[model samples]
Target: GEAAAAKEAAAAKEAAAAKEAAAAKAAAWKG
Candidate 1:
């Protein structure tokens, strides 16, 4: 159960990071 929870958490973190990176790239291009 703990391993499953940890894996989910890591995936969520990775998703957030990727989203943020995409946003940053868009802003740079718009500038």
Candidate 2:
């Protein structure tokens, strides 16, 4: 149970980071 919880959290964090990176790229292109 503990390992599964950590895995899910890590996956969620990765997704959030990817979204932020895409947002940053879009802003840079607009600028």
Candidate 3:
């Protein structure tokens, strides 16, 4: 349970970060 929870948390953060980066990149491109 603990391992699965930790892995999920890390994966979520990483995916969210990449998504944010993509959003910023799109904004910059539009600007």
Q: Which candidate number has the best TM-score?
A: 1
What tens digits encode model 3's per-residue C-alpha lDDT throughout 1-31?
A: 8999999999999999999999999999998
TM-score of each: 0.82, 0.81, 0.76
Each candidate: RMSD to true structure?
0.7, 0.7, 0.9
lDDT of 1 by residue, 1-31 (tens): 9989999999999999999999999999999
Model 1: lDDT of residue 28: 100
Q: Give the per-residue Cα lDDT of candidate 1 at 5.
A: 100
Least well predicted 10-residue stretch by lDDT in candidate 1? 12-21
Q: Between 1 and 3, whose lDDT is larger?
A: 1
- Evaluate residue 17 in candidate 1 and report its C-alpha lDDT on the 0 to 100 scale: 93
Rank candidates by lDDT, best first: 1, 2, 3
Between candidates 2 and 3, the one scoring higher on TM-score is 2
> Poorest 10 consecutive residues of model 3 by lDDT?
22-31
TM-score of 2: 0.81
Assess each prediction's global lDDT (C-alpha) against the native: 0.96, 0.96, 0.95
